[PDB]
């Protein structure tokens with residue numbers, strides 16, 4: 001029985017950036033335990049409803065280690081929506097967002113849905129990346145952008161639901 | 176080299192085409208395998224977590240018991 | 252004619268060389284995916300235990316307060 005769709009999503013980005021909390025907040029875990037640190041992969045499921053239908057989201061969170069290079073391509077290649085995630089507390093994370101965009105373009109599929117996620121927007125006092133400058137990156141590359149906080153719990157649920165709507169609207173187009 | 180180029184371009188025309196068709200075949204299996212391996216690891220990751228959580232749930236209600244008594248003797 | 256044959260052979264060559272190198276990669280995939288899968292599953296296993304372990308140590312030691320820090324309430 002239910003669900004009645006399966007979107008496969010991916011979280012990618014620099015380490016430190018809080019990819020993994022951003023997940024843990026969406027999937028609603030009561031706990032901190034993860035294998036990201038040690039292994040470099042972790043995974044979470046959440047079904048949501050959008051305009052009435054069940055939508056199973058499988059969310060992979062990748063951390064680059066070259067150790068599992070092959071497997072993590074498999075995730076790129078098979079991913080329906082991927083979130084690029086920087087820390088607004090840290091520039092190079094933001095600078096690299098271009099670099100990742102490479103990978104995504106190079107390792108991943110030709111129509112994938114894409115979303116730049118400016119994380120930790122919660123801590124303004126340690127802000128190095130202007131939002132304005134954040135949006136411009138996004139607009140340049142014609143992709144959606146969103147500022148977030150895994151800890152204040154800001155826009156994480158919205159970031160996903162937004163990406164999930166974007167995936168579905170595309171698929172419903174191929175009726 | 177009119178027959179040499181008319182003939183060789185047919186060999187190179189098939190060569191580039193041969194691999195074209197071969198590429199799709201090599202790539203198509205490399206996707207079927209990846210899906211299979213997604214579904215396998217989705218299952219494992221779900222297991223590792225599922226197990227580790229019930230370890231924690233229990234660890235929870237043992238410390239929750241001791242903070243019930245630990246504070247009460249600590250009061251006076 | 253005898254002119255045009257100097258185009259196909261020096262670009263289709265950058266083509267076939269490019270594709271040849273692809274399959275070389277796509278060939279080594281199945282094995283790797285498997286190779287990696289083993290290493291992941293092991294690592295999954297080992298970490299899983301180390302995690303369920305740590306949260307068991309702390310279920311017994313927290314319970315030994317209900318055995319050796321509740322009787323100090325019975326002793327004092």
Ligand SMILES: Nc1nc2c(ncn2[C@@H]2O[C@H](COP(=O)(O)OP(=O)(O)OP(=O)(O)O)[C@@H](O)[C@H]2O)c(=O)[nH]1
Nearest residue numbers: 014015016017018019020021119120123149150151
């Ligand atoms: N203030 C603040 N700190 C955050 C936020 N998100 C993550 N962090 C911190 O950033 C650090 C790394 O978070 P992770 O989720 O592990 O980062 P990651 O990129 O997903 O994975 P790693 O490679 O382990 O860093 C942790 O110390 C978090 O507490 C945030 O939104 N706001």
